[PDB]
């Protein structure tokens, strides 16, 4: 999944995939996983600063039948199997349940959305 609206303060990439590391000392300061693990610093940030990992987790509801308690992986297998060609519009639960994610990602091809925007 991509951290929509978030840009890395060291390499400047935005809407990046992977884990997001937020500094709890610097104002509005985030690093992508690569910059974090490599010890990148910019402006007033130091590697001693505590950081919060923001990311995955979660159980999700299938938008087509309402069954609950899927992981991201198990949701995709369930959808790509039992809801294969359904053209009914639904809102993505993964996008809505993740921080900064799109609260109303409407899609009429959920299986394809999962494969392209929620890669495992």
């Amino acid at each position: 999944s991509r951290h929509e609206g978030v840009s890395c303060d060291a390499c400047l990439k935005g809407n990046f995939r992977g884990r997001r590391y937020k500094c709890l000392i610097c104002y509005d300061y985030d690093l992508c996983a690569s910059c974090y693990e490599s010890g990148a610093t910019t402006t007033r940030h130091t590697t001693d600063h505590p950081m919060q990992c923001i990311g995955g987790g979660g159980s999700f509801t299938c938008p087509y039948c309402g069954k609950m308690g899927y992981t991201e992986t198990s949701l995709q297998e369930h959808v790509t199997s039992e809801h294969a060609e359904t053209s009914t519009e639904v809102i993505c639960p993964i996008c809505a349940a993740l921080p900064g994610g799109d609260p109303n990602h409407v899609t009429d091809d959920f299986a394809a959305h999962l494969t392209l925007e929620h890669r495992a």
Partner: peptide
């Protein structure tokens, strides 16, 4: 940076 978070813009939202």
């Amino acid at each position: 940076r978070c813009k939202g």
